[PDB]
Amino acid sequence: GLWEQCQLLKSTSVFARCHPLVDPEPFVALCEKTLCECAGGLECACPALLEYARTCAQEGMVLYGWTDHSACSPVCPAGMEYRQCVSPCARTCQSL
C-alpha cells in the first residue's frame, strides 16, 4: 500500500518535468528498496524523492512543488521551513 508513493516520480507532474534531464527509473527502484527496508509508513519513500529532486536541481531544474505534491517534508531546525532554491549570502540580523 506504499508502492504508489514511489510511483510519484513517474506519475506526478512536478517530478515529470525533469524526465528529459533525469531518468526516474533508478530513483523509483531505490525507492522500492527503501520501502522494503524501512519499518515506517509512507515516509519510508522520501529519501529517494528528495535525492531525485536534488539531482534535478543539479541538472538545472528545481522541483518547486515536490514537498507538497507528496507527503515528504525534510527535517529542519526549529522555526525554519524547508524550501527549494534558498539563496546563498543569506541575510541575518547582524550582516550588512
Partner: protein, 98 residues
C-alpha cells in the same frame, strides 16, 4: 462547428491539440469516429501530450489515422517553448504556399 463547411479549399487546416488529462472511459467511446471524420474532412490533428496525466492512448489513436498527425509528448509545459520552433516549422511544412 469550426469546420462546419470548408471555406478555404486552398489551405491546409490543422488542429494543434494541447492535451494534459485523461478522458473517463464513458466519454472516450466516440473519439476514433471524430478523428477519422476529421481526416475525412482533410483536417490534420497534431496531439501534444503534456505531463504524466495525458492519456497516451488517444495520442497514438490520433497518430494511427495518418502520418501527418505526428505527435509530441512532453514532461511539462516548460518545454513547450523548447518545442516551439520544430512545432511551427512542422505546421508550415504541412501547409502549401500561395
Amino acid at each position: 462547428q469550426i469546420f462546419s463547411k470548408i471555406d478555404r479549399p486552398e489551405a491546409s487546416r490543422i488542429a494543434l491539440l494541447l492535451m494534459a488529462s485523461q478522458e473517463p472511459q464513458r466519454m472516450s467511446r466516440n473519439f476514433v469516429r471524430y478523428v477519422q471524420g476529421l481526416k475525412k474532412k482533410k483536417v490534420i490533428v497534431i496531439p501534444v501530450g503534456i505531463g504524466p496525466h495525458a492519456n497516451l492512448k488517444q495520442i497514438r489513436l490520433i497518430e494511427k489515422q495518418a502520418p501527418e498527425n505526428k505527435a509530441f509528448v512532453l514532461s511539462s509545459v516548460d518545454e513547450l517553448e523548447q518545442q516551439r520552433d520544430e512545432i511551427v516549422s512542422y505546421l508550415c511544412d504541412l501547409a502549401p504556399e500561395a
